[PDB]
């Protein structure tokens, strides 16, 4: 188009189409159980195009989602819900968007508790799997290093 539409976030901030759609539903106070397809499709397309202008990375699913919305819109309008699938998709994704926020808080709260590495008990002196190795290593890379005494 002729103008540069005003946007806070770049597309990288979104985890795909459902995520973008949930943001728009929020921005324009759309009722999620009763979606104004045309309007939302309009908001969705305008954002995508704006990002495409900036040679940004539009993941594959965004274009698929566009075709999906344009098609739902045509069917409802032209002569010859069709959107209950999409509504249920959104509600489902939203459920785990929120559950993942609660997890994020716990990740942070857990991070505030400091542990020490094990003692070297070699002086005082096995069935394992690939998970046990990955675990041993993740436990190691999680270790914060404190400044050593001078």
């Amino acid at each position: 188009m002729d103008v540069q539409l005003p946007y806070n976030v770049k597309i990288e901030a979104f985890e795909g189409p459902l995520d973008l759609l949930l943001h728009l539903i929020n921005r324009y106070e759309i009722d999620i159980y009763d979606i104004p397809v045309a309007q939302i499709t309009e908001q969705y397309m305008a954002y995508i195009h704006a990002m495409q202008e900036l040679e940004l990375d539009i993941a594959s699913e965004y274009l698929v989602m566009a075709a999906t919305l344009l098609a739902i819109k045509s069917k409802m309008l032209l002569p010859p819900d069709p959107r209950e699938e999409l509504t249920q998709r959104l509600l489902e994704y939203k459920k785990f968007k929120e559950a993942a926020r609660e997890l994020k808080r716990r990740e942070e709260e857990r991070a505030l508790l400091f542990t020490k590495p094990p003692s070297d008990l070699s002086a005082y002196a096995l069935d394992v799997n690939v998970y046990d190795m990955l675990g041993a290593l993740s436990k190691l890379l999680r270790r914060k290093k404190l400044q050593k005494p001078m």
Binding site: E61, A99, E107, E109, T115, K116, P118, S138
Partner: protein, 167 residues
């Protein structure tokens, strides 16, 4: 009950971030697990005094000593190396799904998220937060994913039952 709790303190201290299981603790003290637990529970109470800097927590099937959260601003002042980055939103949303819906397949995950989820699955596997828990019985025999004890530890969870309920 005093020398037993000193011993458990010493054992947990030397076990560090790996912790000890109740049986391990019982086996060293040569007592029943229910007796070990009473010692641990007393030790926990001792650590609850405002005067104490460390606490005994139960994370992921083991007991371990950790600092209290109120002291975190002081501990941070001595951090040169931060350790593991916080998870991406993609990894975190993939993980929430597996946490609540396990065992679950790549397909079902991709269905909920609406995008391909190979990257975050790879991320979570390498952090030992999820593992393969079998194959589904269906045409493609697709892998099922579940969460690990490491998953519980990483999110301050005693057990999966402690997860916040789903909205």
């Amino acid at each position: 009950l005093k020398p037993a709790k000193a011993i458990v303190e010493a054992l947990l201290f030397a076990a560090g971030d790996e912790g000890l299981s109740l049986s391990q603790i019982a086996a060293v003290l040569e007592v029943s697990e229910l007796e070990a637990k009473a010692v641990i529970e007393e030790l926990q109470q001792d650590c609850r005094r405002e005067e104490r800097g460390i606490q005994l927590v139960e994370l992921g099937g083991v007991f371990l000593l950790a600092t209290k959260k109120e002291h975190a601003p002081y501990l941070k002042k001595l951090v040169e190396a931060p350790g593991a980055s916080p998870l991406s939103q993609a990894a975190l949303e993939t993980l929430a799904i597996i946490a609540y819906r396990q065992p679950i397949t790549r397909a079902e995950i991709e269905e909920i998220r609406g995008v391909k989820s190979d990257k975050p699955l790879q991320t979570l596997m390498a952090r030992a937060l999820i593992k393969e828990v079998g194959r589904a019985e269906g045409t493609g025999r697709p892998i099922l994913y579940g969460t690990t004890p490491e998953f519980l530890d990483y999110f301050g969870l005693k057990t999966l039952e402690e997860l916040p309920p789903l909205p």
